[PDB]
Structure 1
Amino acid sequence: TAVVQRVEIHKLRQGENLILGFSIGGGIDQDPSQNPFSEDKTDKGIYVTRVSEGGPAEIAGLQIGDKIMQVNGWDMTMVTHDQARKRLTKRSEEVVRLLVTRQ
């Protein structure tokens, strides 16, 4: 029911920032019952909740609803929302590889 995908996002510079062109929800500090994208409503994982049309994530193949398992090898299955955000937005990293699962 879930298929593994590997995407390689090349961030886009927007002013001082490097951006990925998507949004995330979830995390072990959040209420998993409110995540509309998961199969199991106790799943506290990080999910892609929106993708910017024409942005880096879209070009790389990311899709709304994808569950993020790893970012550049870092486990994303049991992290807080803020930890996930920080891992995805390291200013020093222009390329981020995401391991995701897709229903």
Structure 2
Amino acid sequence: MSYIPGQPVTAVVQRVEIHKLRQGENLILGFSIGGGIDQDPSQNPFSEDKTDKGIYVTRVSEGGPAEIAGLQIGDKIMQVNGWDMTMVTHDQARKRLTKRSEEVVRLLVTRQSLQKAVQQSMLS
């Protein structure tokens, strides 16, 4: 899950924005997640990666809205719905993205090397 051929720390900050997936009364997030100063900070007393005390996605559902926006199962989220995730409790970020009122769901992610559907281009 962790390998940097020529991009240690210098990851690609991308934007995930998808319209909440309503279910009866609630909204479904097509990803699993833990990011928090709320979480266990005792594994990265300065940094662990681009994750640190930030928020970061632990999954994404195949075919769910998170994948449509481009979330990648293991990505360090820098923001949730306009909030700032660098040192914010898991629940702070989770509560925002589980607001059944956010017609659209905003996620700022730092995406490192979870390359999918990359198109080849032969330069000769």
Q: TM-score, normalised by structure 1?
A: 0.83
- Higher percent of residues as strand: 1
Contact 1:33 1:42 in 2 (8 A): no
Does 2:98 match 1:89? yes
Report how far residue 36 of structure 1 moved: 14
Report how far residue 15 of structure 1 moved: 2.2
Contact 2:34 2:55 in 1 (8 A): yes
**4+ residue runs over 2 A deviation:** 32-42
Higher relative contact order (CA 8 A, sep 6+): 1
Larger radius of gyration: 2
Query: Where do 5+ consecutive residues of structure 2 fail to align?
Result: 1-9, 112-123
- Higher percent of residues as helix: 1
Distance 1:10 1:38, change over 3 A: farther
Distance 1:34 1:53, change over 3 A: farther
Q: TM-score, normalised by structure 2?
A: 0.71
**Superposed counterparts of 1:44-63, under 5 Å:** 44-63=53-72
Q: Percent of counterpart pairs with the same letter?
A: 99
Please identify, of 81-90 and 50-59, the stretch whose mean Cα deviation from structure 2 is larger.
81-90
Query: Where do 5+ consecutive residues of structure 1 fail to align?
Result: none
Distance 1:2 1:88, change over 3 A: same
Report how far residue 53 of structure 1 moved: 0.8
CA RMSD of aligned residues (A): 4.0
Report how far residue 38 of structure 1 moved: 7.8
How many residues are paired up? 103
Q: Which residue of 2 aligns with 1:34?
A: 43
